[PDB]
Symmetry: D2
Subunit: 400 residues, 4 copies
C-alpha cells in the first residue's frame, strides 16, 4: 500500500553491497530481481489493471529513495517508469489496456532503445522497412539504449529511411525484448552509472506486428509540434532525472555524515577537540543541507505541477506544457548543481582516510557526473532564461 | 475577500513614486496611510475579533507582494504583523480579547521597541521600575526600534533594574504609542530600508499600567527555555524577513526584465542584433530565475510548517519548534544569498545607462544589503549544520 | 621622485573627505587641483619631454593607491593616463614631442570624447565635416565622455558622415578643451563613480586644424585591422580599469578590517567574546584576501607583459597584441568579480550599525558596480574562451 | 640543460600510458626509472655537489610539467624534492656534503616516513630508543609514508617514548632504505594518486648511527617555535602541493580542449553547428582559464618569495617566515579550488561519450580530490584570515 516503505526496505537490503556493486560494474542481477519481486515495477500502472495507481509525487519519492541507496538503480528504475506512460501518450486504448495488464500481471521490466537526442532522423542507425501486412522490420544497432538488457518489454524507435511516402517517419513500437533478432549487448562501461545497462542493442530483421506499433507513423514528432499529450515525454523524463540526482546527493550527504560521526579526526593543530565540533565542518554540512533544501522543495512543486498537467489529459494547452517544462528545466539545473557540489564537497569533511576504495565514497560524484551529461544543463538554464525574459517556451522534443 | 489582490492594488499605486521615495528617505507617511486604509493591518487578527483571520502562508504572500513594490514597506508591514501575536503567545485571554479587538476595529499600526538581540539583559537601555499597583515605569532610550514612529500600539520590553526578586527580568508590554514620556525619534538613516522608521525611542518616566503587562516578569525568557509557544517569536520573524528579501529580489528581476526588453542595447562588437537574444544575458536571467525558484519553494514549505506548528497552540513540543527553526534558518540563508546575488547581478544585464539615478536600480540591493545584517546569516547556516551533523536544535532566543 | 609616495600622501589627505565627496557628486575640483600641483599628471610622459618617465607597472601602482582612497579619482586619473599615449600610438613624431612637452610643462589634465564603443560609426553623434585647408569641423553631442569637463587637452573622435571618399572615417584629434564651440556639460549622474565627470560634451562648429589631426583619416580603425601599435588602446585602458577595481576592493577591505577591529560586536548568542575571533568572520576575511591575491598577481603579470609589448614599439606582431589582450581580458574578469564580491561581502563582517551613511561603506560597491558595466565582462570571459579553445585572438576594437 | 624541456620530453610518453597506469594503480616502476635516467632527481642539489643547482621557481615549473602529464608522478617527484633540503634546514655541513653528494652521484630517489601531522607526538607509531653511542633504534609502522617504496635514501622521524630524558623528542634521520629492518609495504590504495606509494613502512629494530641523525633531539620542533630555518618545511611542502594541483588542472583542461575540438558534437536541438562555436562551451573554457590564471600567477609570486626567504639562510626573521606561509596558504586554497573546479567542470564541455573509461577523464578530479585532503583547506583559509584581520602569523608546524 505505501510504496515508499517498500522502496526503503530494498534500499536497506542493498546498502550492504553498494560498494561492491559500484566496484564490480555489470548487471545488478540480484537487485533487479528484488525490484521485480517487490511489485514496484507496476507503480504507475493504474490499479484497475493490477498496478499501484500511484500519483507522480509518490512515484518520484520512490525513485529518490532508491537513488539514495544506489544511483544506478534509481536511474534504471526511474527510466523504466517513463516507458509505459508512452503507451497511453501515443498508443491506442486497446494497447493501453493490454500492455498495462501484462506489465502489472507479469512484473515486467521495460527497456528502451528509442530516441537519438542529437542526430538527424535520417542518420539514426535503426531503420524500419514497411511490411506487406502493415508492420515493419527493424535492422541496425542503437548505440545508447537504456535498460534494454534485462528488460521484458522493449520500446524501440525505427526510422523509415527508404523511398516510400513515410520516408523519415519515426515508428514507435513496444516489443518483447526476447523476440528473435533483438540482441542487447553487455558492453556498457562508464566512470559511473555502472549498473544502468546503457550499452548497445542490435536489431537483425526484427518483426514488429501492426498491433505492436504505437500510434501513426511519426506520432511522437507530431505530438511535439502541437504540444499534445505525447509532448509530456521530456518533462516527465527530466524531472525523474533531476530526482535521481537529488537522491544521489542525499546518499552522499548521509554517507559523509555517518563517517564524520564515526571515523573522522579533529584537526588538532587548530585545537579542535572532536571532528563533529569543527566550526568549518559544521558550516559545510549547513551549506550542503541548505542547497538540498532549496533544490528538493523545487522538485516537489514541479511534481505537483506535473500531476495537475497529467490530470488534464488531452485538454492540456501548449502553455500548460511550456510552463511545466520551464519549471522542470529549473529543477534539473538546481539538482545537477547541488548534486555535483555535495558529492565532491563532502570529501572536505571526510578527510584523507576516506579516500580508501573500501568506502567507495567517489561513487556518488561519479554517478551524478556521468548522467548529468545526458543532456547539457547550459540549455536547461537558457530555456528558463528565454522564458523569464521573452516569455518563450522550449520547442518540444526528446530533451525539452 | 482576497488580501493579495488588495496588496497588488497597493503595489500598482506605489509604482510611480518608488524611485523618488527611496531618494528622499524619511517616513512613507502617505503609503502608511494607504495601508492602514486597506484593512491589511489586521490581516492576522482572527475574524472573531474583527480581523481577516488569514493564515501564515496567505499573510506571507501579502508581505512579498508589497516587498516587491517597496522593500521598506514590505519590511514595515511585515514586522508590524509579528507584533500582535505576542499577545496570544504570552499574553492572557482578556488581553487577547481586549487588544486584538482594538487593533482590528481602530485600524492600528503596531510597532516595537522590544529586544536588543546582541546585548546582555542587564545592559539593555530601557529599564523598568516596578510600581506597587503592580504596574511599571520605563526609563531609557531604545536605539533600534522598528516602526515605533507612526504606530498606535507599541510593544516594549524593559528590564527590571532595581534589586527586587524580579531583578534582571524582561517585562513585556503593549502601550499606546502616544503615551506621555515616549518619544519616537525621526533619526533613521541607512543606505537601504530608508523608510522602515527603524530609529531610536526614548522613554521618560513612562507609565505601563498593570493590565498592559503581557504575562509574568520574564515570560519570554522562560518560554524560550521550555520551547513553549513564546518561542515561536524567532521563526515567525525570520520567515517574514526571508520573504521580504525574496520580494525584493523579484522586484529587482522584474525591473531588470522590463529594462532589458525596452531599453538595453545589443553588444554590437560581438554581432548581437537583439539585446533579448544575447546568449549570456539569457543565461543570467535563467540563473536568477532558478535561484529564486529554489528559495521561494523552500520558503513556501516553511510557511506551511509554521502554520502546522502554530495550529497546535500550547501542545507544540520542543521538537516541533526545533525542526521549524532549522527549516526557517535555511530559508533565511537561501533568501539572503539569492536576493544579494540577484539585486547585484541584474546590473550586468541592465548595462551602463541603468546606473542613472532616475532608475534607482540600486535600491533593491541596498534594501537587502541593509536588512540582511540584522542577524548574521553565517549563524543561520551553522544552526542548520549543527542539526544535520549533530541532531541538535537551536537554543531558542530572539533570533533563533 | 617616487610617484607612489606622492600618491600615498594625496591618499592620506583625500581619505578625510571621502564620504563627504561621495555623497556630494559633481566635480572634485579641489582634488583635481591637488593632482595638478603634485606633478603626477605627466607620470607617463617621458623624462626627455619633462615628465616622470615611469614604466607601466609603476603608473598602475599609482592608479591603485589612488583608487583605494577614492574610486572616482582612481578612474579619473587612470583614464587621463590612457589619453596622451594615443599621440605616440597613432600620431606623428612632431606631435608627440610637441604635445608631450606641453602636457608636462603645463601639467595638463587630458579628457576624452572619443569612441562610441557600441555604435556603428555612421550613427556616432559627432560628425566631422572636412574643410579645404585639410582640417575638419565638428558637430554633435557625444553623450558619454570621460573627464572632458575640467580637462585642458581633449582627445576627440568624429565621423565623416557626408558623401565624400573618406566616408565612415574616424577622425582622431587632440584639441584644447577651451576651444570655441566645445561645451562639456555638468550632466554626469550615476549611482557610483559620481566624480568622474563622465557627462556629455557639445561640439558646435568646432574647428580641428590639420596639424591637430592624429594620423591619417580612419587611422585607429586601420590600426585595429592590422594589430598595429594603435591597437594597444584596449589592452591599456582595460588593464587600468581592472586596477581601479582592485584598488577599490582593497579600499573596501581596509575600511572593513578597521571597523571589525574597533567597532564590530561579537555575536553573543553564538557565545563569541571578541569580533576578531569569530570563526566565520576570520574565514570571510581569508576568502576576500585570497580572491585579491589571485587577481592582483594576475594584474601585475599582465602589466609586465604590457611593458614588454609597449617596448617593442612598431615591431609588435598581431600575436603579441592578441596574447596581451587575452591576459588583460582575464584580469578584467578576475578584478570585476573579486571587487564586486568583496565590496558587497564586507558588510557581512561589518554588521547592522555599519549601514549608517556616516560610514559611506557602500561607496566601494557602487563605484565598482557602476564602472564594471562600461563593457560586458561576459565578452571578456568569452574572448578568453575562444582563445583557449580555438586559438583565436579577440578582434581589435575600442574594448578588445 | 633546461630541466623543463627534459621534463617536457618525458610527459609526452607518460601521457600515453596515463589511462592504463591510473586504471592499473600499483607503483610506476618504469616511469620512476625514466626520471632516474633523465637526471632530474638532483634538480635541487647544488651544482657543487654534482646536482643541477636549480632555483625554486625552476624546480616548481618542472613539478607542474610532470603533474600535468601524471598527477601521481608530479606528486611523487615533487615530494622527493622536499626531502634533501631537510639536510640543510636542520642538518650539519658535513651531512650536506656527504648526502647531497650521494644523492646526486648515485641518482637516488629519496622518500620519507616522517611526520604524523595530526597526532600528538606520544601517539606517533615510529618510536626511537636512544642508544649509548648517541644513535637510535626505531620500531613501529608509520601508516602513511611518501615514496618510501623504491627509494634509496629514506628520511624518517621517530619519537622518543620511553623513560628517557629525551621523552617527547622527534628525531629526524636519513638512512639508506636498504638498511636491515626497513620494510616499505605495497599496500597503498585510494581513489586517486594511485601510483604515489603513500603506504605504510615498517621499522623493526632499525639502527640509526649517530651521524645519520639530522640535528639535535627535537631539532624541527625547536626550529618551529623560533621560526628558524627548519620552519621552512611547511611552506616548501605546501607550495609544492599547490603546484601539483595546478599542473593536474592544466592536464585536465588540455585533455578537454583536445576532445572538444576532435570528438564533441554540437547540440543540434539548440541549433548549434560546431561544438567549438557553442557560446556556453566557450564561456566555460574562459572561466577555467581565468581561474587558473589567478591561481598560477599567485603561485609564481610565492615561489619568488620562497627563493628570497630561502637565500637569507639563517638570517630569516620570524616575520619573513610568517609572511611567506600566509602567501603559500592562499596559493594552496586558490590551487585547491581551481583544480577541483576545472577537473569536475570540464566534463560539462566533453559530453556523455567522454565518460567512457578509455579516456580516464576522471583521473584528474580523483587525483586532486584525494591529495587535497592531506591537510584541511579551511585552515589555510583561516590562517590567511587571521593575518589579514589581526596580523597573526601561523603557528609553525608540519603543515603550516
Amino acid at each position: 500500500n505505501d510504496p515508499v516503505a517498500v522502496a526503503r526496505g530494498l534500499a536497506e537490503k542493498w546498502r550492504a553491497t553498494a560498494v561492491e556493486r559500484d566496484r564490480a560494474g555489470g548487471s545488478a542481477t540480484a537487485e533487479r530481481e528484488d525490484l521485480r519481486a517487490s511489485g514496484l515495477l507496476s507503480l504507475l500502472v493504474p490499479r484497475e489493471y493490477g498496478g499501484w495507481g500511484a500519483d507522480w509525487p509518490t512515484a518520484i519519492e520512490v525513485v529518490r529513495e532508491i537513488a539514495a541507496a544506489d544511483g544506478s538503480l534509481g536511474h534504471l528504475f526511474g527510466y523504466h517508469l517513463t516507458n509505459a506512460p508512452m503507451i497511453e501518450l501515443i498508443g491506442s486504448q486497446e494497447q493501453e489496456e493490454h500492455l498495462y495488464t501484462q506489465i502489472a500481471q507479469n512484473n515486467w521490466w521495460t527497456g528502451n532503445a528509442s530516441s537519438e537526442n542529437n542526430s538527424h532522423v535520417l542518420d539514426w542507425k535503426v531503420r524500419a522497412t514497411p511490411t506487406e501486412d502493415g508492420g515493419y522490420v527493424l535492422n541496425g544497432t542503437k548505440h545508447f539504449c537504456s535498460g534494454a538488457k534485462g528488460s521484458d518489454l522493449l520500446f524501440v524507435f525505427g526510422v523509415v529511411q527508404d523511398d516510400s511516402p513515410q520516408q523519415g517517419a519515426i515508428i514507435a513500437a513496444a516489443i518483447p525484448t526476447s523476440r528473435a533478432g533483438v540482441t542487447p549487448n553487455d558492453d556498457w562501461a562508464a566512470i559511473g552509472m555502472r549498473q544502468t545497462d546503457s550499452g548497445s542493442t542490435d536489431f537483425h530483421n526484427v518483426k514488429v506486428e501492426p498491433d505492436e506499433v504505437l500510434g501513426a507513423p511519426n506520432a511522437f514528432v507530431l505530438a511535439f509540434i502541437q504540444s499534445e499529450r505525447g509532448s509530456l515525454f521530456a518533462p516527465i523524463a527530466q524531472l525523474i532525472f533531476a530526482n535521481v540526482y537529488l537522491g544521489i546527493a542525499h546518499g552522499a550527504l548521509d554517507a559523509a555524515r555517518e563517517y564524520t560521526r564515526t571515523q573522522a579526526r579533529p584537526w588538532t593543530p587548530a585545537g579542535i577537540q572532536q571532528a563533529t565540533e569543527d566550526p568549518y565542518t559544521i558550516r559545510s554540512y549547513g551549506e550542503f543541507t541548505i542547497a538540498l533544501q532549496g533544490a528538493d522543495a523545487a522538485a516537489r512543486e514541479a511534481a505537483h505541477l506535473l500531476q495537475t498537467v497529467w490530470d488534464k489529459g488531452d485538454a492540456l494547452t501548449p502553455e500548460d506544457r511550456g510552463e511545466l517544462m520551464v519549471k522542470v528545466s529549473g529543477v534539473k539545473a538546481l539538482a545537477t548543481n547541488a548534486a555535483l557540489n555535495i558529492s565532491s564537497g563532502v570529501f572536505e569533511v571526510i578527510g584523507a582516510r576516506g579516500t580508501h576504495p573500501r568506502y567507495g565514497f567517489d561513487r556518488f560524484w561519479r554517478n551524478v557526473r556521468t548522467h548529468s551529461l545526458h543532456d547539457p544543463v547550459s540549455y536547461k538554464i537558457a530555456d528558463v532564461g528565454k522564458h523569464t525574459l521573452n516569455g518563450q517556451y522550449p520547442i518540444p522534443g526528446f530533451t525539452s
